Design a protein around this ligand. Structure first.
Ligand SMILES: [Mg+2]
Ligand SMILES: [Mg+2]
Ligand SMILES: [Mg+2]
Ligand SMILES: [Mg+2]
Ligand SMILES: [Mg+2]
Ligand SMILES: [Mg+2]
Ligand SMILES: [Mg+2]
Ligand SMILES: [Mg+2]
Ligand SMILES: [Mg+2]
Ligand SMILES: [Mg+2]
Ligand SMILES: [Mg+2]
Ligand SMILES: [Mg+2]
Ligand SMILES: [Mg+2]
Ligand SMILES: [Mg+2]
Ligand SMILES: [Mg+2]
Ligand SMILES: [Mg+2]
Ligand SMILES: [Mg+2]
Ligand SMILES: [Mg+2]
Ligand SMILES: [Mg+2]
Ligand SMILES: [Mg+2]
Ligand SMILES: [Mg+2]
Ligand SMILES: [Mg+2]
Ligand SMILES: [Mg+2]
Ligand SMILES: [Mg+2]
Ligand SMILES: [Mg+2]
Ligand SMILES: [Mg+2]
Ligand SMILES: [Mg+2]
Ligand SMILES: [Mg+2]
Ligand SMILES: [Mg+2]
Ligand SMILES: [Mg+2]
Ligand SMILES: [Mg+2]
Ligand SMILES: [Mg+2]
Ligand SMILES: [Mg+2]
Ligand SMILES: [Mg+2]
Ligand SMILES: [Mg+2]
Ligand SMILES: [Mg+2]
Ligand SMILES: [Mg+2]
Ligand SMILES: [Mg+2]
Ligand SMILES: [Mg+2]
Ligand SMILES: [Mg+2]
Ligand SMILES: [Mg+2]
Ligand SMILES: [Mg+2]
Ligand SMILES: [Mg+2]
Ligand SMILES: [Mg+2]
Ligand SMILES: [Mg+2]
Ligand SMILES: [Mg+2]
Ligand SMILES: [Mg+2]
Ligand SMILES: [Mg+2]
Ligand SMILES: [Mg+2]
Ligand SMILES: [Mg+2]
Ligand SMILES: [Mg+2]
Ligand SMILES: [Mg+2]
Ligand SMILES: [Mg+2]
Ligand SMILES: [Mg+2]
Ligand SMILES: [Mg+2]
Ligand SMILES: [Mg+2]
Ligand SMILES: [Mg+2]
Ligand SMILES: [Mg+2]
Ligand SMILES: [Mg+2]
Ligand SMILES: [Mg+2]
Ligand SMILES: [Mg+2]
Ligand SMILES: [Mg+2]
Ligand SMILES: [Mg+2]
Ligand SMILES: [Mg+2]
Ligand SMILES: [Mg+2]
Ligand SMILES: [Mg+2]
Ligand SMILES: [Mg+2]
Ligand SMILES: [Mg+2]
Ligand SMILES: [Mg+2]
Ligand SMILES: [Mg+2]
Ligand SMILES: [Mg+2]
Ligand SMILES: [Mg+2]
Ligand SMILES: [Mg+2]
Lengths: 257, 134, 158
RNA sequence: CGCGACCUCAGAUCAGACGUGGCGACCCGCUGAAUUUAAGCAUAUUAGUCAGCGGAGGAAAAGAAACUAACCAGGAUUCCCUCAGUAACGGCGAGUGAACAGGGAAGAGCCCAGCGCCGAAUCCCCGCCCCGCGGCGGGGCGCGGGAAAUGUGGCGUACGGAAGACCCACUCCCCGGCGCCGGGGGGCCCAAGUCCUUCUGAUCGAGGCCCAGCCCGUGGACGGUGUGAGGCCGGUAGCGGCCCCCGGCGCGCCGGGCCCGGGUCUUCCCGGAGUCGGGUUGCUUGGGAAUGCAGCCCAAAGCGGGUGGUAAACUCCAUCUAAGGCUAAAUACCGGCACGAGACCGAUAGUCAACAAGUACCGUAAGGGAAAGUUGAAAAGAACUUUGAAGAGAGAGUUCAAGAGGGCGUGAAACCGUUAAGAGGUAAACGGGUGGGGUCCGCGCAGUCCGCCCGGAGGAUUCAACCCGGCGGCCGGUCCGGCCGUGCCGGCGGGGCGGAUCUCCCGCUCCCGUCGGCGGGGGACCGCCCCCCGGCCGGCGACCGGCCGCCGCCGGGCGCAUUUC
RNA sequence: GGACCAAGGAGUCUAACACGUGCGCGAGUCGGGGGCUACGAAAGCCGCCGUGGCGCAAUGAAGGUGAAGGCCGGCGGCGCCGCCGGCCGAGGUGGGAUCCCGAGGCCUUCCAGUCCGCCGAGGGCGCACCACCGGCCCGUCUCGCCCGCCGCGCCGGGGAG
RNA sequence: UGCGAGUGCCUAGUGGGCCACUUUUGGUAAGCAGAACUGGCGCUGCGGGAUGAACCGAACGCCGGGUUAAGGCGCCCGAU
RNA sequence: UCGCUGGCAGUCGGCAGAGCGAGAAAGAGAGUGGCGCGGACGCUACGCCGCGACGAGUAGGAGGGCCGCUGCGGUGAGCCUUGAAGCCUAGGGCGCGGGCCCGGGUGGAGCCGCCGCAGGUGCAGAUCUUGGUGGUAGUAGCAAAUAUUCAAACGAGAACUUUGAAGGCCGAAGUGGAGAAGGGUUCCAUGUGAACAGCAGUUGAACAUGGGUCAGUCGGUCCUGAGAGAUGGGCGAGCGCC
RNA sequence: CGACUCUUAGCGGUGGAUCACUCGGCUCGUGCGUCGAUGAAGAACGCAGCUAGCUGCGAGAAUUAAUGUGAAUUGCAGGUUGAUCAUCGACACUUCGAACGCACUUGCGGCCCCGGGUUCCUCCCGGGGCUACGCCUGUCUGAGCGUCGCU
């Protein structure tokens, strides 16, 4: 807010006596705004309680190592069909979930043939769902240039641009990501993992160079390796109903007293 | 999506620049589509309205197929008056009803040197655009 | 008022610190402006190095840092005349000069002289008049092969 | 006495110029508090801050060491990170508080006076001729007039310089005009549904448009249009188009300005005073036996002077050269001209001001300073009859709606009118327990179904079994084949990464093609990784294919009625 | 304090510190300043951009110094130090969650004996932590005797309490 | 005889008190002023003392049945 | 609520065999010799289930909110001109409560649930701020300076306007006639009766239309007074001052 | 029964909350970064057919010229060889104001030149151009028992 809002006027308390309430009053004169209450948050006019300042802590810092950890987590969760379904993408007719296409796609330059490619890959139901989900935003976002809202469509990861962005920029919901500049803000909208991504063959080949393997460090990071697992076999039922554990157990007591 | 860093997507700015436009901008804003045969023969899609163009009303209470000649283009209210779109006042005077030019299709233009110049310029620009596209 | 065990602090907030608070909201804009100006300079000097003239090897002064080397201000007059470049010609061909710097020992002198001579052997001199080559010019074969180099002209590595 | 120079000093509506005042967000120079904190208060803090005065620019100021240091030394200024809440200051209380070095942004250096040498080699103005001209300059001509020896110009400035002599090298500089070749400002244009059916007062809504899931899309930002539009319109996208004007980097021509360098030796030349410094006083600083500034007194030197964070003497070192001047960049910007955006406010909010707002209004004045947005899609703003003096009513009419009638969107509460119901001598209201009466609801008014079996009437293409085809789930004690390993073992295997593990060539420096030394390249070795070959192990339940076997399901035949439904 | 009603109305933001929780890496960690590549003023990268901050070492006003020892064998001046060479080599006591061993024993006719599982008197190696005893580093005090050499000195070093 | 113990951090509010049986100082005395021990009120409702901060009983989630405490049983008003 | 830091992965099913509550440690142990195709529910493990004891509270502390408000990122092939937000309701209900969901009416263009994020986020008070409305109450009051009556006219309308008559007052230091300061069109005429003139009005200093101020000889202009104020000069950091 | 009072509900008033809107603010960022004696900022007064305020303009006064554009403006009237808008480089720009002939009533002047008076003979009238302070370079006219030289 203006740092001088509500402090323009000259005003002072009438004091005790006068049968008024010791708040500052506007100095005299034959107007409505006269002896009326000027300073303080409770008055009509005057400042507010704590005038918001511009030097609030607006930006936050996070460690690079866990930036990379989260981006790896998002990529890992993007390749499990149940998680994409839970996120809501229509992928019931996708051939294989880590959907990778030929490098010739990177040379497209027409939105019509981009749409044809989506039709062939059977990912068009998601764009139709985005179309169905376009509507007006509720509240005072209307009059602040955020009038219209819609749903996130599938993302497309490319290695080198040769018109792929020109082709896919016009289709709603589609976002384009260079493989070497991945970001969590677009690979996990709303903080939720499992966005439906369509890869290009070159980008898919280059991904393990970017992030390294379990035994090989990243080739184009300064010093980065994949994060370790706290537990390797996460399937709990298989562990529990195994002969080794079933052997060293007492008999269950499931009779209710 | 708009990419020019010098034009506004700002709602209030657009409404201000529309409701406080000068007359020579009002003229461009008040444009109407040409009919099918006219657009096919002139290779032009839209055209600003003039005082003596014959038109059809497409939307509203008066939508129909009859032809009406514009009688005046009142650009301060962004309206035009067609000579048989009118209603009856309480006393008995007949009064025109204003129709926005965008809900009106032109069936016969009036042509002079400036009109022909504008039509040929628009047609040439469209043709070179198609040639560049193909 | 002091409380249970804690640290006793001295905040320097008793002046009017709020009437002068320097925020950094224009930091990205300043970075973009600086790099645009840098590119404009780099392409206004067409074949010349982007980082500017060559600079000599320097020891850091104090005991804390006297084991490292870095880049200096300019080549001194003594090493410049040992190498054989003229005072007024060094900086017109691309050699930084400062007349304030001494030369106490001989190894640093000789290292700077070697650097200067190697740079002189390396540089390519265009003709003053494009169709009129002269004695000290470079030939057309490397005139067609000349280009800019990025970063420091000869990185100083310890 | 007069006349004539010069020096000082006047007067002009003399000829031609220049300053004043405004704004003031950022900057430069003075002046300069007190609230406040110290739980009192006087030094200290607030604070070199508010207020006051003066002066600019598009930035200003600063700036090329009378520097930092004590190292193996750095090298103009300015800004950022750190140094650092540190050394230091402080009723040593409260509190205050830098700099060097290191890493970056930017990077650029120069000119006088003085000492000297060149016949004042210098500059200004008037008149005339030619050229150019909206930045008043170029050439020529004047026995034209002045400034200047009480010092103009050329060379030249601490990094040394000048002259002479000898060697080597050199004619690629600049500007004033003219013409020619390839960013900014303005103007006008450039895709596709008003398709069929159907809601509505109005559609931009709803459904559809095939086997091309209507058409465009490098254009699905936005705004308008009678609700809610990628295709109705303006725009949006495009290294898209066309038309004018201005500048630059380029080119050629004309003309003018200068006849200019480097190395070696010899001989000469070499600097800024009421200033530095000292005493004292006052302010200031972290600067403490005095950091900086100023007043007054004293008052310099030339191997001198300044500095080297404790006063002084003596003695060696180090490092600069004051008392003259100019200088872009990086840096600041709540005023101004344009712009773009927002996890901001939404008419008691947001600027005081969304509106005829610094307006009305109050004060002698300095100054103080409001309230105030919304009919409807479109005025279609209620013709006409009637009562009344009129306001104001009754009809009539417009509109989808007057239950929107000119302060008119929605229309809450306090308060009031009327209608209906109920009640009423301990003010009223309230908690717990019932009872009575009302208003509505149950769509209450003969009251649950759900499986299995028995019996009776029915009606079907009908059950079990068998055959043909498809799919699926589990296996093969050890079927065959693959793929993987955050596994291993080999290798007469082919590579990338790294190494504070070792050792042929090149470059450099010092030595009469030579010895020894420095930088790099090459080679070997080691570790890791990737790939090819071979062999074990594990998996195929984040990761399977085929044949066989079993089982299940579906479809089709065949089943023909004590079955099945 | 309060006639009544509506709207507004008061622990916020910055910086510092302390502790507790959650995440990543871990004797390291952190680019925040700089640089390179519509939303995007975001995001990504740099490692010879880790300069630097905090941590990894303390103590003294300062000059400064700066964090185990014992045994064997003989000698020089019983022991002790050094020359030596080798060997062991980084505390002890009590209490300690858990782990290890195991006298024996857990039935379907009776005996012998196998495997697996289990319980278990008693005995052990002992985490973190607590208490205590020793030991080592810096300052200081008291008492002492030796060693070193480029300069044998108003020198340097060492011991016990 | 009864009971699971030890131990470490960070921490708000408070720092005007008052009353009663027995002990007790000043004062003629005080619903006065000042102490000791225990329990209360403040922070606490409930049955009785007609009425009451501290008196007697008894301490509290929302309910049904039963029985009691202190105090009561002519009528108000449950119970001779 | 707390404790038991109790129980449940055993839904082990024709590849089957239904158990783990019972005073007193530990095997529903393995082996070596002597037809009919069938079997409820469950377990968002941050869930479900079983026993015990307990429940006062100001200052203060902590936990849980599928309590509530505004905005952002996700998501509901969410809702809506066949009716959103808002508002009213003797209508039906849920929740211990904060609150919420349906029905009816009015209204006419937008809104909400879930997972996270952010905050100018919940009012009964502050002689709180602004706006509005009551009882008081048709009450107090419309009492300083002697005074009015009759007839007519106009007018829809007369205690108050105008005309005439009558009776009074001011009483020449006036309730008269004229100027200065100040006011600024109030002056004059015509018309109107919404608002104002504290009753009313046919009237008005109200409102609306138009009009109206003439100079050699009245004043200013000219003079100087008490005083004010430049230049020369001085002082002054400076605006400037003396 | 009725009046009066109290509660609840319907409708109607008073009042203008809530909800939805928004040509306005606030904050951040970018580019530029420009006043004045050739008369600024500010102020006063005037200008429209019907016009108070706001806006625009200056006696050429809700604008002239020129260029672009290309048929309107509009509340009511009136009458394409270019209406209206925008741009804006030509022209114009009242009185004060640093404010400049002296003072600030708008009063009083002086000088030169035109046109009336005149027939320059002066007055009188109208118009035009000058008439501020400081300061610089040069010019002219000067001053000094200041320093001299010739007489
Ligand atoms: Mg405000
Ligand atoms: Mg809302
Ligand atoms: Mg405290
Ligand atoms: Mg003159
Ligand atoms: Mg001072
Ligand atoms: Mg104090
Ligand atoms: Mg105090
Ligand atoms: Mg005091
Ligand atoms: Mg004091
Ligand atoms: Mg101070
Ligand atoms: Mg100031
Ligand atoms: Mg000035
Ligand atoms: Mg300026
Ligand atoms: Mg400067
Ligand atoms: Mg300077
Ligand atoms: Mg110098
Ligand atoms: Mg420095
Ligand atoms: Mg520190
Ligand atoms: Mg200070
Ligand atoms: Mg530095
Ligand atoms: Mg740099
Ligand atoms: Mg000279
Ligand atoms: Mg729209
Ligand atoms: Mg449709
Ligand atoms: Mg559409
Ligand atoms: Mg649209
Ligand atoms: Mg279009
Ligand atoms: Mg278009
Ligand atoms: Mg464009
Ligand atoms: Mg001080
Ligand atoms: Mg000293
Ligand atoms: Mg000097
Ligand atoms: Mg200097
Ligand atoms: Mg942006
Ligand atoms: Mg309002
Ligand atoms: Mg307001
Ligand atoms: Mg309002
Ligand atoms: Mg409102
Ligand atoms: Mg309001
Ligand atoms: Mg309204
Ligand atoms: Mg309605
Ligand atoms: Mg309405
Ligand atoms: Mg209304
Ligand atoms: Mg009522
Ligand atoms: Mg009644
Ligand atoms: Mg009161
Ligand atoms: Mg901690
Ligand atoms: Mg007492
Ligand atoms: Mg109390
Ligand atoms: Mg208690
Ligand atoms: Mg009690
Ligand atoms: Mg009693
Ligand atoms: Mg009971
Ligand atoms: Mg009794
Ligand atoms: Mg409780
Ligand atoms: Mg509407
Ligand atoms: Mg907010
Ligand atoms: Mg409220
Ligand atoms: Mg309230
Ligand atoms: Mg009365
Ligand atoms: Mg009365
Ligand atoms: Mg009276
Ligand atoms: Mg009189
Ligand atoms: Mg009179
Ligand atoms: Mg009158
Ligand atoms: Mg009246
Ligand atoms: Mg004076
Ligand atoms: Mg009610
Ligand atoms: Mg409203
Ligand atoms: Mg007018
Ligand atoms: Mg014109
Ligand atoms: Mg024109
Ligand atoms: Mg006067």
């Amino acid at each position: 807010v203006s740092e001088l809002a509500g402090h323009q006027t000259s005003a002072e308390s009438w004091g005790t006596g006068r049968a008024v309430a010791r708040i500052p009053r506007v100095r005299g004169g034959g107007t409505h705004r006269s002896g009326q209450g000027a300073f303080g948050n409770m008055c009509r006019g005057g400042r507010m309680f704590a005038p918001t300042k511009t030097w609030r802590r607006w930006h936050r810092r996070v460690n690079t190592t866990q930036k990379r950890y989260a981006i790896c987590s998002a990529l890992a969760a993007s390749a499990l069909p149940a998680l994409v379904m839970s996120k809501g993408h229509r992928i019931e007719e996708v051939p294989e979930l880590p959907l990778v296409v030929e490098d010739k796609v990177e040379g497209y330059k027409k939105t019509k043939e981009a749409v044809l490619l989506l039709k062939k890959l059977k990912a068009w139901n998601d764009i139709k769902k985005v179309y169905a989900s376009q509507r007006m935003r509720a509240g005072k976002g209307k009059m602040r240039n955020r009038r219209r809202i819609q749903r996130r469509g599938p993302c497309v990861i490319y290695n080198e641009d040769n018109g792929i962005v020109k082709a896919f920029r016009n289709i709603p919901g589609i976002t384009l990501l260079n493989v070497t500049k991945l970001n969590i803000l677009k690979l996990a909208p709303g903080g939720h993992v499992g966005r439906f991504c369509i890869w290009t063959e070159s980008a898919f080949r280059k991904l393990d160079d970017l992030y390294g393997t379990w035994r090989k460090a990243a080739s184009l990071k300064s010093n980065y390796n994949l994060p370790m697992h706290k537990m390797l076999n996460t399937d709990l039922s298989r562990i529990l109903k195994s002969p080794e554990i079933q052997r060293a157990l007492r008999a269950p007591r499931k009779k209710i007293h | 999506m708009k990419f020019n860093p010098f034009v506004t997507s700002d709602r209030s700015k657009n409404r201000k620049r529309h409701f406080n436009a000068p007359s020579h901008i009002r003229r461009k804003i008040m444009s109407s589509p040409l009919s099918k045969e006219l657009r096919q023969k002139y290779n032009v899609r839209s055209m600003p309205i003039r005082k003596d163009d014959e038109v059809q009303v497409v939307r509203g209470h008066y939508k129909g197929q009859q032809i009406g000649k514009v009688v005046q283009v009142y650009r301060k209210k962004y309206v035009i008056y067609i000579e048989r779109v009118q209603r009856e006042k309480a006393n008995g005077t007949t009064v025109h009803v204003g129709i926005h030019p965008s809900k009106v299709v032109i069936t016969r233009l009036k042509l002079d040197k400036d009109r022909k110049k504008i039509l040929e310029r628009k047609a040439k620009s469209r043709q070179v655009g198609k040639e560049k596209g193909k | 008022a002091p409380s249970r065990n804690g640290m006793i602090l001295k905040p320097h907030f008793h002046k009017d610190w709020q009437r002068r608070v320097a925020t950094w909201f224009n930091q990205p804009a300043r970075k973009i402006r600086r790099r645009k100006a840098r590119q404009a300079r780099a392409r206004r000097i067409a074949p010349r190095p982007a980082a500017g003239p060559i600079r000599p090897i320097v020891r850091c002064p104090t005991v804390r840092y006297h084991t490292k080397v870095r880049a200096g201000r300019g080549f001194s007059l003594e090493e410049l005349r040992v190498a054989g470049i003229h005072k007024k010609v060094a900086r017109t061909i691309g050699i930084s000069v400062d007349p304030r710097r001494r030369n106490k020992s001989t190894e640093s002198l000789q290292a700077n002289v070697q650097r200067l001579k190697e740079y002189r052997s390396k540089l390519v001199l265009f003709p003053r008049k494009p169709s009129a080559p002269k004695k000290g010019d470079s030939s057309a074969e490397e005139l067609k092969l000349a280009t800019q180099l990025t970063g420091p002209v000869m990185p100083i590595r310890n």
